[PDB]
Amino acid sequence: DKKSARIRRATRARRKLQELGATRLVVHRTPRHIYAQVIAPNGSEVLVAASTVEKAIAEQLKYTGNKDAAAAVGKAVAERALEKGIKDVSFDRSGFQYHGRVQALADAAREAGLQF
Amino acid sequence: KTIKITQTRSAIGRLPKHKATLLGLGLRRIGHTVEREDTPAIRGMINAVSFMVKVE
Amino acid sequence: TRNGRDSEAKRLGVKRFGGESVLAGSIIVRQRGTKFHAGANVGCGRDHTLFAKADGKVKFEVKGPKNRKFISIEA
Amino acid sequence: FTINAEVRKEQGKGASRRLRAANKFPAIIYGGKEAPLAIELDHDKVMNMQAKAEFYSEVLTIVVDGKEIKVKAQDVQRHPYKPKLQHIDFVR
Amino acid sequence: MLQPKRTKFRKMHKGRNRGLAQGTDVSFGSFGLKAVGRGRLTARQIEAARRAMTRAVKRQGKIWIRVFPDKPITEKPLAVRMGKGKGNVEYWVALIQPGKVLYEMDGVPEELAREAFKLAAAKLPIKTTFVTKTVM
RNA sequence: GUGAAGAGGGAAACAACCCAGACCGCCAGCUAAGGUCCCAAAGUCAUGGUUAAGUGGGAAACGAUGUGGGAAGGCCCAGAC
RNA sequence: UCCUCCUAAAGAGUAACGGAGGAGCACGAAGGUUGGCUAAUCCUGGUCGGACAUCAGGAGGUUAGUGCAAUGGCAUAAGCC
RNA sequence: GCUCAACGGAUAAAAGGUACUCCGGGGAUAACAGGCUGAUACCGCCCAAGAGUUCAUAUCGACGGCGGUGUUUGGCACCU
RNA sequence: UGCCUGGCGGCCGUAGCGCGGUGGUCCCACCUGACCCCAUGCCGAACUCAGAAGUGAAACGCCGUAGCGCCGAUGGUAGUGUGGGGUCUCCCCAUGCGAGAGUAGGGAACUGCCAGGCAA
Ligand SMILES: [Mg+2]
Ligand SMILES: [Mg+2]
Ligand SMILES: [Mg+2]
Ligand SMILES: [Mg+2]
Ligand SMILES: [Mg+2]
Ligand SMILES: [Mg+2]
Ligand SMILES: [Mg+2]
Ligand SMILES: [Mg+2]
Ligand SMILES: [Mg+2]
Ligand SMILES: [Mg+2]
Ligand SMILES: [Mg+2]
Ligand SMILES: [Mg+2]
Ligand SMILES: [Mg+2]
Ligand SMILES: [Mg+2]
Ligand SMILES: [Mg+2]
Ligand SMILES: [Mg+2]
Ligand SMILES: [Mg+2]
Ligand SMILES: [Mg+2]
Ligand SMILES: [Mg+2]
Ligand SMILES: [Mg+2]
Ligand SMILES: [Mg+2]
Ligand SMILES: [Mg+2]
Ligand SMILES: [Mg+2]
Ligand SMILES: [Mg+2]
Ligand SMILES: [Mg+2]
Ligand SMILES: [Mg+2]
Ligand SMILES: [Mg+2]
Ligand SMILES: [Mg+2]
Ligand SMILES: [Mg+2]
Ligand SMILES: [Mg+2]
Ligand SMILES: [Mg+2]
Ligand SMILES: [Mg+2]
Ligand SMILES: [Mg+2]
Ligand SMILES: [Mg+2]
Ligand SMILES: [Mg+2]
Ligand SMILES: [Mg+2]
Ligand SMILES: [Mg+2]
Ligand SMILES: [Mg+2]
Ligand SMILES: [Mg+2]
Ligand SMILES: [Mg+2]
Ligand SMILES: [Mg+2]
Ligand SMILES: [Mg+2]
Ligand SMILES: [Mg+2]
Ligand SMILES: [Mg+2]
Ligand SMILES: [Mg+2]
Ligand SMILES: [Mg+2]
Ligand SMILES: [Mg+2]
Ligand SMILES: [Mg+2]
Ligand SMILES: [Mg+2]
Ligand SMILES: [Mg+2]
Ligand SMILES: [Mg+2]
Ligand SMILES: [Mg+2]
Ligand SMILES: [Mg+2]
Ligand SMILES: [Mg+2]
Ligand SMILES: [Mg+2]
Ligand SMILES: [Mg+2]
Ligand SMILES: [Mg+2]
Ligand SMILES: [Mg+2]
Ligand SMILES: [Mg+2]
Ligand SMILES: [Mg+2]
Ligand SMILES: [Mg+2]
Ligand SMILES: [Mg+2]
Ligand SMILES: [Mg+2]
Ligand SMILES: [Mg+2]
Ligand SMILES: [Mg+2]
Ligand SMILES: [Mg+2]
Ligand SMILES: [Mg+2]
Ligand SMILES: [Mg+2]
Ligand SMILES: [Mg+2]
Ligand SMILES: [Mg+2]
Ligand SMILES: [Mg+2]
Ligand SMILES: [Mg+2]
Ligand SMILES: [Mg+2]
Ligand SMILES: [Mg+2]
Ligand SMILES: [Mg+2]
Ligand SMILES: [Mg+2]
Ligand SMILES: [Mg+2]
Ligand SMILES: [Mg+2]
Ligand SMILES: [Mg+2]
Ligand SMILES: [Mg+2]
Ligand SMILES: [Mg+2]
Ligand SMILES: [Mg+2]
Ligand SMILES: [Mg+2]
Ligand SMILES: [Mg+2]
Ligand SMILES: [Mg+2]
Ligand SMILES: [Mg+2]
Ligand SMILES: [Mg+2]
Ligand SMILES: [Mg+2]
Ligand SMILES: [Mg+2]
Ligand SMILES: [Mg+2]
Ligand SMILES: [Mg+2]
Ligand SMILES: [Mg+2]
Ligand SMILES: [Mg+2]
Ligand SMILES: [Mg+2]
Ligand SMILES: [Mg+2]
Ligand SMILES: [Mg+2]
Ligand SMILES: [Mg+2]
Ligand SMILES: [Mg+2]
Ligand SMILES: [Mg+2]
Ligand SMILES: [Mg+2]
Ligand SMILES: [Mg+2]
Ligand SMILES: [Mg+2]
């Protein structure tokens, strides 16, 4: 199984980040689509969420699952997050190597105004 | 409502706890009819040293 | 005899018990390995010594997948 | 295979031993949606009853307060070395 | 003579033989020799009581030994002062509480069983009694 | 816990066991442990049983138609033991 | 002299010429951190090659490992890279 | 810069003999005897594989078991 | 309102295994490919990127099932604090506490925020 190997690969970051009590930006990648959601320091309730599965963002792009789409999500989430009042957050890469789409999402989230 | 407690046995070869309990009830010597307010505590104190006290 | 040796005892155990108000820095448990784990506002030193990181009342919890004992503090 | 039996009122270590030192012993009836029923009964009868192999198989009707309850002997506690019963679990 | 084949520890604390036994029901065989008294059975006593049974019932029948020593008893030599170590392990004993089935027997008559267990009972220090396998 | 560092009453006598903590006096009364036929203060007390061994008033494996209770299990009027 | 376990009577502590074992170091990577990984032992097939070297899959799941005793601990891995 | 490892380290630096002995002490501590104990010793008894031509119990009694004594070897160190 | 997915928790075996199923329009998965980003102590297996032909096989999710695990009374037993007592290596009595194992039975979890698709 792959999933389970990705969960335990993530867990250290998650458990460390819930201990500090920080608002984390979870980013689930998928072969088709990329997701993102800013979750409260308690961990249960979500404040902001956006993805390429949302038609509002899906209708604009060429294909939902690439660096240019991940930037469009990474911008979108950080556009909402500032309207809600969020600014200082952390970035939970969630067992995905900080390299392609997730880096494109992170850089877009930085460029959009979200402080981390 | 009060309860008349009486010490009916010596407190010589006794445990420090039981020696204390009598000091907490206010019993000094054998044949000392001390009356106390009836609460769940005092009944507990009496229950601790029931072997050496008598209730009226 | 063949043996007759022993080590000096280490004074390990729960120092501050559940409910007890502790100060920031106070040691809660000296132990060898993580019998108890660090929860909220509790640290864990090189010696696996759990200590308070904030002024509050010590709380012993039993949570997690493997059913482990955690020590948290709540002000 | 019919035994008269009283309902228990005291129950614990102190009561049970006092009871067993009076030619009786504690048993219990349970089964179905109804509540369990603690049952004091005579020793010398039930000692003679268990010699027969039917006792640990067939249905027994225990008489309690007039009412006859149908049961089977599920489990039983022998006294360690002396030939005598301590306790019987009657399933309904 | 029964003995553990290798152990973790050579010498063991004296302990306190208390409470009631657990091997109380007659499990394997039809008949059994239950220990009424309390005490301890040496390896020698068990073998001596086994030989006395086995010889009484002849080649026929089947016998179990529910007890096993697994407790080493030390003893200090003669003309030796106290201390200067724990003594040396001399014999092996099984602690027997009341209720313990010691021996079990099967494939013989009730008449010839009881007489076989008497001869064993005469070799043992503990007061014993006959017990039959009751169905539940 | 007691003695040590605690006298007094009991356990024959008996630091440590049971009862109980002596400030002094009285030719007063109630009790504790333990006792009540005589030595020696108080029941030859009352009721219902057991014990025949002087058990009580040292001791085991094992031995035995001792002797009391019980709860069962083998036979009768075709009359068993 | 120091460490580990039991004795030690479910906080700590606790003796004996009581019961068992270790230490008088090691390491510029065996530290730091970041990013990864998962073990034993079998089963079946396969050149030399056989019980066992290396490979493949399946079974088991921490019986493994932890620089060295024992203890407590570690998959978020303190394990191996 | 110290196996000051007798590891809170008396000196930088230290082994023996005394039946030729002596002083101060101790029944805080041994040797004799007493005491407590009874593993051992001694003396009984229980079971009875067997021996006794047959036959366990005339006489012996293996394997084991339970006591007594305070006679041995001891243990303890309570008196001196 | 409900039915289906994903994400992130709460709760950690009544929640886990096995077995029997069934699901692809989105969701998820394998699957396609290998200039580019990056990757292999060899290997686009993994990690990674560009895609959307293929299928729900495996995986994953959901429904069914006691195969086991797991939970689990009442009663009794063991143990034990305190005061007594005995035939004192061990017990017993008054009173307080009271298991473990087993037994009847229960049992193929339960939720919260959020996002999408479909019947509305
Ligand atoms: Mg007293
Ligand atoms: Mg006075
Ligand atoms: Mg020291
Ligand atoms: Mg230690
Ligand atoms: Mg110590
Ligand atoms: Mg630290
Ligand atoms: Mg009760
Ligand atoms: Mg209850
Ligand atoms: Mg009791
Ligand atoms: Mg039913
Ligand atoms: Mg013990
Ligand atoms: Mg046991
Ligand atoms: Mg068992
Ligand atoms: Mg000599
Ligand atoms: Mg020596
Ligand atoms: Mg003095
Ligand atoms: Mg006195
Ligand atoms: Mg006196
Ligand atoms: Mg006397
Ligand atoms: Mg007298
Ligand atoms: Mg006198
Ligand atoms: Mg006198
Ligand atoms: Mg004396
Ligand atoms: Mg008295
Ligand atoms: Mg006084
Ligand atoms: Mg005075
Ligand atoms: Mg006065
Ligand atoms: Mg008077
Ligand atoms: Mg009067
Ligand atoms: Mg009297
Ligand atoms: Mg007198
Ligand atoms: Mg008189
Ligand atoms: Mg008279
Ligand atoms: Mg006499
Ligand atoms: Mg007899
Ligand atoms: Mg009759
Ligand atoms: Mg030192
Ligand atoms: Mg301990
Ligand atoms: Mg302790
Ligand atoms: Mg303790
Ligand atoms: Mg020591
Ligand atoms: Mg050494
Ligand atoms: Mg390294
Ligand atoms: Mg290296
Ligand atoms: Mg290391
Ligand atoms: Mg890491
Ligand atoms: Mg990097
Ligand atoms: Mg290991
Ligand atoms: Mg270890
Ligand atoms: Mg453990
Ligand atoms: Mg490391
Ligand atoms: Mg020194
Ligand atoms: Mg030296
Ligand atoms: Mg020192
Ligand atoms: Mg020193
Ligand atoms: Mg020198
Ligand atoms: Mg000389
Ligand atoms: Mg001279
Ligand atoms: Mg002199
Ligand atoms: Mg002198
Ligand atoms: Mg001395
Ligand atoms: Mg001599
Ligand atoms: Mg002399
Ligand atoms: Mg002498
Ligand atoms: Mg004597
Ligand atoms: Mg003797
Ligand atoms: Mg004689
Ligand atoms: Mg004889
Ligand atoms: Mg004889
Ligand atoms: Mg012959
Ligand atoms: Mg003597
Ligand atoms: Mg003599
Ligand atoms: Mg004697
Ligand atoms: Mg002597
Ligand atoms: Mg002396
Ligand atoms: Mg002494
Ligand atoms: Mg003199
Ligand atoms: Mg559970
Ligand atoms: Mg299937
Ligand atoms: Mg399918
Ligand atoms: Mg498709
Ligand atoms: Mg591929
Ligand atoms: Mg691929
Ligand atoms: Mg298709
Ligand atoms: Mg379901
Ligand atoms: Mg069903
Ligand atoms: Mg089950
Ligand atoms: Mg539970
Ligand atoms: Mg259970
Ligand atoms: Mg429970
Ligand atoms: Mg209960
Ligand atoms: Mg008591
Ligand atoms: Mg008395
Ligand atoms: Mg008597
Ligand atoms: Mg309870
Ligand atoms: Mg239970
Ligand atoms: Mg059991
Ligand atoms: Mg259970
Ligand atoms: Mg059921
Ligand atoms: Mg059901
Ligand atoms: Mg289930
Ligand atoms: Mg069902």
Side-chain angles (χ1 to χ4, degrees):
Chain A
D1 189 50
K2 259 170 219 177
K3 193 73 170 290
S4 56
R6 198 178 56 74
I7 291 163
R8 67 141 191 75
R9 173 197 318 166
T11 306
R12 178 118 253 151
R14 294 261 178 75
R15 295 287 177 285
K16 181 53 166 187
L17 202 51
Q18 84 188 52
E19 180 260 294
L20 290 150
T23 315
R24 68 172 184 283
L25 169 49
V26 168
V27 45
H28 187 250
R29 190 179 60 73
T30 310
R32 179 126 50 62
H33 297 292
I34 184 161
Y35 302 73
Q37 53 183 240
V38 166
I39 298 151
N42 79 78
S44 188
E45 76 191 33
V46 180
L47 312 149
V48 179
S51 57
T52 49
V53 175
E54 292 182 324
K55 68 195 172 68
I57 309 269
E59 285 166 309
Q60 297 179 330
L61 297 142
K62 181 174 173 286
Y63 173 73
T64 53
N66 48 34
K67 292 176 194 170
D68 59 281
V73 178
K75 190 177 174 181
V77 176
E79 278 186 331
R80 289 125 182 272
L82 296 164
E83 294 173 309
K84 274 287 189 300
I86 309 302
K87 190 171 176 181
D88 190 51
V89 292
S90 302
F91 186 88
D92 193 281
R93 69 186 169 74
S94 311
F96 292 107
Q97 186 134 302
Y98 187 85
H99 177 65
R101 277 196 271 168
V102 299
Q103 193 181 181
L105 194 145
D107 293 335
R110 292 195 228 285
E111 284 183 316
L114 193 59
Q115 275 287 329
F116 66 94
Chain B
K1 297 182 179 181
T2 55
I3 282 176
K4 269 183 285 292
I5 311 160
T6 313
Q7 183 172 0
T8 190
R9 211 135 280 279
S10 174
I12 281 167
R14 298 287 171 240
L15 310 187
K17 238 197 204 207
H18 295 154
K19 293 282 262 281
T21 307
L22 297 167
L23 183 137
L25 289 169
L27 299 168
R28 314 184 153 284
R29 62 197 147 280
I30 186 166
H32 200 327
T33 56
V34 173
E35 72 186 341
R36 292 274 160 273
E37 296 173 28
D38 182 36
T39 59
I42 297 299
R43 297 292 293 183
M45 285 187 202
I46 293 155
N47 186 43
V49 297
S50 57
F51 67 87
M52 65 190 303
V53 304
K54 296 206 170 185
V55 173
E56 302 172 42
Chain C
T1 67
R2 186 65 200 170
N3 30 244
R5 291 173 302 284
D6 199 8
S7 52
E8 195 187 325
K10 288 284 127 62
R11 329 304 162 117
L12 310 177
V14 174
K15 300 292 177 278
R16 298 291 196 285
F17 295 86
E20 181 164 5
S21 53
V22 299
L23 292 168
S26 292
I27 292 168
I28 307 172
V29 190
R30 277 209 176 286
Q31 82 275 30
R32 283 283 150 269
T34 51
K35 234 161 164 94
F36 305 91
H37 288 264
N41 307 313
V42 173
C44 183
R46 64 174 301 285
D47 189 36
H48 306 280
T49 302
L50 304 182
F51 64 98
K53 296 174 63 150
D55 302 288
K57 298 189 177 178
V58 170
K59 187 68 180 287
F60 284 86
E61 295 285 356
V62 186
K63 74 237 294 205
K66 299 181 179 177
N67 208 64
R68 292 179 172 177
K69 297 151 187 165
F70 276 77
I71 298 180
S72 298
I73 290 168
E74 192 165 31
Chain D
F1 275 31
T2 66
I3 295 182
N4 293 15
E6 302 187 350
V7 183
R8 295 195 74 186
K9 58 190 185 291
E10 298 191 338
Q11 52 188 24
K13 203 148 107 151
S16 178
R17 295 203 190 192
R18 269 194 299 282
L19 203 148
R20 296 213 212 77
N23 308 335
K24 295 187 180 178
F25 71 90
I28 185 149
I29 295 168
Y30 59 81
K33 71 194 174 67
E34 294 89 51
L37 183 58
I39 291 296
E40 164 182 330
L41 39 68
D42 192 63
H43 198 283
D44 295 300
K45 295 285 193 297
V46 180
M47 189 66 261
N48 295 333
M49 291 269 300
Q50 71 137 46
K52 297 179 180 182
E54 283 79 43
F55 188 93
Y56 299 106
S57 51
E58 297 196 333
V59 180
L60 296 84
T61 56
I62 302 178
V63 190
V64 185
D65 305 325
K67 296 182 182 176
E68 303 191 335
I69 311 173
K70 303 183 71 61
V71 287
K72 296 183 181 175
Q74 183 70 5
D75 208 315
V76 61
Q77 289 185 15
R78 298 274 189 283
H79 188 280
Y81 55 98
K82 292 168 182 182
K84 39 165 64 176
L85 301 166
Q86 290 192 333
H87 188 273
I88 295 168
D89 290 289
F90 290 114
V91 160
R92 216 176 302 180
Chain E
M1 212 171 75
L2 294 178
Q3 191 173 282
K5 321 174 147 309
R6 135 198 172 82
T7 52
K8 290 163 60 53
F9 298 110
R10 289 168 88 191
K11 307 207 267 278
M12 186 175 286
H13 285 163
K14 185 196 302 292
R16 295 285 181 284
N17 185 41
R18 259 136 94 178
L20 302 162
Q22 296 280 342
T24 311
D25 297 310
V26 179
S27 186
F28 313 131
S30 295
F31 310 128
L33 187 62
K34 184 171 281 192
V36 174
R38 185 179 306 282
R40 37 204 251 180
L41 292 176
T42 59
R44 292 177 178 284
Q45 288 159 22
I46 292 157
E47 189 175 39
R50 187 197 58 75
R51 284 207 199 84
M53 279 150 60
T54 317
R55 203 164 290 280
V57 304
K58 313 294 187 176
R59 66 187 184 77
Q60 66 166 34
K62 186 172 181 75
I63 294 161
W64 290 264
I65 314 177
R66 294 283 302 284
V67 309
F68 192 86
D70 62 68
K71 187 196 170 63
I73 301 307
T74 61
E75 192 141 42
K76 216 128 191 163
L78 197 146
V80 171
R81 301 243 189 90
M82 294 285 106
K84 322 230 175 227
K86 176 91 179 276
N88 259 301
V89 175
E90 288 304 323
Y91 58 96
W92 287 86
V93 303
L95 300 178
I96 302 303
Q97 302 82 2
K100 190 104 172 130
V101 172
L102 307 167
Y103 296 97
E104 257 175 60
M105 189 162 280
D106 194 43
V108 286
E110 294 165 42
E111 293 180 355
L112 302 179
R114 285 169 178 282
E115 292 299 312
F117 282 127
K118 192 196 292 296
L119 308 201
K123 310 310 194 173
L124 306 181
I126 301 154
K127 196 186 295 303
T128 55
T129 190
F130 190 103
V131 286
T132 316
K133 167 161 98 70
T134 56
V135 178
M136 205 168 66

